[PDB]
Amino acid sequence: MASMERFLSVYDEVQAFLLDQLQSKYEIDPNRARYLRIMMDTTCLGGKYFRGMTVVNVAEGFLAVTQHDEATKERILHDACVGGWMIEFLQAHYLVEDDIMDGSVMRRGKPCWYRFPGVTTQCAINDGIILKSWTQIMAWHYFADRPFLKDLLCLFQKVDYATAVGQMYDVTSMCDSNKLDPEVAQPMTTDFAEFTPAIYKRIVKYKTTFYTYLLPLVMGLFVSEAAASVEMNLVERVAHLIGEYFQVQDDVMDCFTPPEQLGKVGTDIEDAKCSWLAVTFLGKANAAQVAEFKANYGDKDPAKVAVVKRLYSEANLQADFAAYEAEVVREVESLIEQLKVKSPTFAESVAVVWEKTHKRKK
Amino acid sequence: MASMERFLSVYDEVQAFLLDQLQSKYEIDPNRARYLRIMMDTTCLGGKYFRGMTVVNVAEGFLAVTQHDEATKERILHDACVGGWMIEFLQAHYLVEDDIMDGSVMRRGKPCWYRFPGVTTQCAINDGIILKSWTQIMAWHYFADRPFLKDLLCLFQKVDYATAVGQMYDVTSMCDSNKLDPEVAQPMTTDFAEFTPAIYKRIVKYKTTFYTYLLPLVMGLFVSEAAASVEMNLVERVAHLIGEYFQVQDDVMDCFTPPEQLGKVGTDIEDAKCSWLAVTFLGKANAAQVAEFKANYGDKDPAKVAVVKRLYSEANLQADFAAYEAEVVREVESLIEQLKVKSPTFAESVAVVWEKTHKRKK
Numbered sequence: 001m002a003s004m005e006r007f008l009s010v011y012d013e014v015q016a017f018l019l020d021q022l023q024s025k026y027e028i029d030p031n032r033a034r035y036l037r038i039m040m041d042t043t044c045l046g047g048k049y050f051r052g053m054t055v056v057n058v059a060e061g062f063l064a065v066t067q068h069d070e071a072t073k074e075r076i077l078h079d080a081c082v083g084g085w086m087i088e089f090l091q092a093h094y095l096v097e098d099d100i101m102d103g104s105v106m107r108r109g110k111p112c113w114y115r116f117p118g119v120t121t122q123c124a125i126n127d128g129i130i131l132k133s134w135t136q137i138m139a140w141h142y143f144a145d146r147p148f149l150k151d152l153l154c155l156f157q158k159v160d161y162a163t164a165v166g167q168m169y170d171v172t173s174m175c176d177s178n179k180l181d182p183e184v185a186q187p188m189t190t191d192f193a194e195f196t197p198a199i200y201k202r203i204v205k206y207k208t209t210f211y212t213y214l215l216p217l218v219m220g221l222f223v224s225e226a227a228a229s230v231e232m233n234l235v236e237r238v239a240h241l242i243g244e245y246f247q248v249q250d251d252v253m254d255c256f257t258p259p260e261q262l263g264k265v266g267t268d269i270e271d272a273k274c275s276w277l278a279v280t281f282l283g284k285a286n287a288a289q290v291a292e293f294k295a296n297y298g299d300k301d302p303a304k305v306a307v308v309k310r311l312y313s314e315a316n317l318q319a320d321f322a323a324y325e326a327e328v329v330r331e332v333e334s335l336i337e338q339l340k341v342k343s344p345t346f347a348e349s350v351a352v353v354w355e356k357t358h359k360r361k362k
Numbered sequence: 363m364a365s366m367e368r369f370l371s372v373y374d375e376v377q378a379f380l381l382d383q384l385q386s387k388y389e390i391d392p393n394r395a396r397y398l399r400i401m402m403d404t405t406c407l408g409g410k411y412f413r414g415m416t417v418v419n420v421a422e423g424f425l426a427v428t429q430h431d432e433a434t435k436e437r438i439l440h441d442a443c444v445g446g447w448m449i450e451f452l453q454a455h456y457l458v459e460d461d462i463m464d465g466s467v468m469r470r471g472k473p474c475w476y477r478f479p480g481v482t483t484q485c486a487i488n489d490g491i492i493l494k495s496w497t498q499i500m501a502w503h504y505f506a507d508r509p510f511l512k513d514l515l516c517l518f519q520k521v522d523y524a525t526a527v528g529q530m531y532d533v534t535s536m537c538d539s540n541k542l543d544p545e546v547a548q549p550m551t552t553d554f555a556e557f558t559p560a561i562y563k564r565i566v567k568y569k570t571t572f573y574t575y576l577l578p579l580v581m582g583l584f585v586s587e588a589a590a591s592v593e594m595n596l597v598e599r600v601a602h603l604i605g606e607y608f609q610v611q612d613d614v615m616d617c618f619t620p621p622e623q624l625g626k627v628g629t630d631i632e633d634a635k636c637s638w639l640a641v642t643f644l645g646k647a648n649a650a651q652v653a654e655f656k657a658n659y660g661d662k663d664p665a666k667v668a669v670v671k672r673l674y675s676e677a678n679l680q681a682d683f684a685a686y687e688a689e690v691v692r693e694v695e696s697l698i699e700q701l702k703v704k705s706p707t708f709a710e711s712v713a714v715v716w717e718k719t720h721k722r723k724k
């Protein structure tokens with residue numbers, strides 16, 4: 001659409017500013033410049049731009065109802081795009097490191113960045129680090145004189161930290177808590193006692209929901225100078241609820257959506273993740289099903305993986321997904337209605353974000 | 363000494379604040395809290411605290427000559443300590459990721475963090491990420507109302523980025539530039555044409571000197587509200603020059619200092635690094651020596667490593683080190699003399715920092 005081509009045009013400006021800076025200030029050679037250019041394209045582009053386009057949507061909502069000079073309108077949209085790219089690049093940073101940590105093979109229908117032959121884990125770790133640093137270069141350069149600069153940096157820091165904390169909860173979600181010990185190699189849980197909805201909710205709240213929904217929605221408010229015009233407690237509740245749903249969808253897709261469609265190859269069963277499928281299965285299985293799950297979960301062996309998928313299909317988790325979805329539809333609509341008391345415009349943005357999320361097939 | 367025990371006491375406060383926050387705001391369980399506690403201790407403690415104690419030194423320099431209430435003095439010292447810990451933790455972040463990228467085995471006389479049995483590359487990548495995030499939590503929490511907060515965040519961002527850029531220059535310093543290509547597995551240089559003093563200087567300037575010398579010296583100025591009282595161009599020159607010397611020392615030590623003393627196990631020859639030894643050797647070798655260097659460099663094979671060390675010993679690089687050191691002594695003293703025109707107190711801090719650096723055996 002544009003909107004999205006216009007958003008991508010701002011990516012072009014940001015890439016040129018970043019790479020011209022590397023040549024002019026960081027003594028970079030043209031071949032390392034080209035490597036960082038392809039790195040940025042491979043890691044930042046080719047997705048749906050949900051996060052970045054969410055900040056644009058929120059900004060456009062307020063521009064429709066607020067009086068501004070034309071030049072001001074132009075500035076607000078451009079700030080929305082740059083703010084949207086900071087999040088897309090923060091996401092890029094997490095996905096590069098996540099793919100290494102998850103042992104994944106494909107991202108956005110291409111090899112994970114670390115699996116590019118001329119990349120490898122060694123470089124990719126540091127390239128993911130660079131992606132996050134570029135987010136701060138963008139912010140300091142583009143928003144230097146903006147009133148919202150300090151609030152934005154502080155919120156960005158907290159979202160980032162929550163995400164890294166969340167990634168720790170995730171990567172250790174298959175170990176017994178009482179057995180974590182840097183000194184002792186971590187064995188997988190045999191009881192699965194920590195595969196509960198509460199624990200699942202905590203992992204997901206931190207690892208995903210701050211950056212996929214909370215940050216973009218509040219960033220759209222910041223660039224609009226409209227933050228004080230919403231109830232922040234409601235923004236957070238609805239972010240965390242739509243975020244959790246987004247991650248539940250991701251978990252279902254990891255197992256059940258063909259890689260040609262999804263653009264990734266699922267690893268949750270083999271990595272022994274505390275996914276929504278595993279928790280929900282365990283929430284309804286009889287003693288024999290639990291037993292068979294335990295004998296097959298968290299192994300690379302394709303025959304073992306197939307048994308778990310069979311257990312999932314037989315357990316009729318599509319009923320559970322339907323009942324979970326219907327509950328979230330209830331809760332999201334209820335939050336949108338509460339948002340409209342102070343912010344009809346922001347509520348409608350949340351409605352659109354919800355609608356796009358709910359219908360994605362990724 | 364104290365000074366350093368007092369500095370470590372501030373580490374205790376910062377750790378407690380961070381871990382109490384994780385329990386109170388991030389829903390952490392006591393066993394993950396304990397893992398992050400040992401992670402922070404293993405990665406942040408046990409070194410010499412040169413960086414952190416440099417900010418304390420600079421602050422103490424100004425307190426001696428400036429009138430302040432007692433309570434103000436106390437606040438400035440505490441800010442110097444917290445600012446010193448931000449750098450120590452930024453360093454901790456780089457060393458955790460660097461040890462993975464370098465395939466190193468020992469750090470501060472213990473296993474590299476990623477080699478702890480109960481850690482592994484998978485966790486350690488994300489733990490290094492957390493270490494840097496904690497630097498921003500510290501800053502926002504402790505310096506929230508300080509006049510220097512914005513300058514400090516902006517300088518911290520730029521030092522960090524320069525370091526990550528520098529780490530890219532380092533990790534790729536053994537590939538031919540014209541052959542870098544994410545699509546093609548990177549072969550080692552056979553001509554060594556990019557092992558030059560200019561290229562060496564650029565790698566070292568970015569990967570090391572911003573965070574080891576520039577940041578702590580300017581941080582001491584920031585917490586002292588004294589930045590405007592020095593010539594920033596001189597601070598940068600002297601930082602970058604003492605930083606380069608510090609890294610040359612590190613390179614010499616990697617090959618020639620026994621691991622029991624150094625607290626690390628050298629990998630530069632096996633990793634094919636553009637070290638000061640390799641560049642300097644190539645700066646004086648005859649055609650046969652160059653030939654033999656090329657037949658042995660950048661291989662894990664202990665017999666090959668021993669040949670390179672033999673070539674280094676025979677090449678009398680201790681003459682070259684002596685001539686390089688004598689030159690830097692000249693240049694550093696000259697910079698200190700220039701610093702004294704506006705800043706006798708800061709010049710004396712630089713003199714102490716230089717003296718401590720020059721005499722280290724690490």
Ligand SMILES: O=P(O)(O)C(O)(Cc1cccnc1)P(=O)(O)O
Pocket residue numbers: 094095098102104167170207208250254264
């Ligand atoms: O894209 P992925 O790998 O399916 C995922 O959503 C990626 C991701 C990375 C970081 C935080 N949240 C989600 P995950 O949790 O790994 O299943």
Ligand SMILES: O=P(O)(O)C(O)(Cc1cccnc1)P(=O)(O)O
Pocket residue numbers: 456457460464466529532569570612616626
């Ligand atoms: O401690 P190391 O590994 O000797 C080193 O100094 C560590 C280091 C990490 C990051 C930036 N600068 C130096 P290196 O460059 O790897 O030789």
Ligand code: DMA
Pocket residue numbers: 046047048049050051091108250
């Ligand atoms: C797994 C994850 C963090 C997905 C974000 O979705 P997107 O619609 O913006 O497309 P992409 O996922 O490829 O960024």
Ligand code: DMA
Pocket residue numbers: 408409410411412413453470612
């Ligand atoms: C290699 C490197 C970045 C060293 C810093 O020196 P330090 O004196 O402060 O002790 P440690 O090196 O262990 O931090």
Ligand SMILES: [Mg+2]
Pocket residue numbers: 098099102104
């Ligand atoms: Mg993943």
Ligand SMILES: [Mg+2]
Pocket residue numbers: 098102170
């Ligand atoms: Mg993951």
Ligand SMILES: [Mg+2]
Pocket residue numbers: 250251254
């Ligand atoms: Mg997934």
Ligand SMILES: [Mg+2]
Pocket residue numbers: 460461464466
């Ligand atoms: Mg190293």
Ligand SMILES: [Mg+2]
Pocket residue numbers: 460464532
């Ligand atoms: Mg290194």
Ligand SMILES: [Mg+2]
Pocket residue numbers: 612613616
């Ligand atoms: Mg070294």
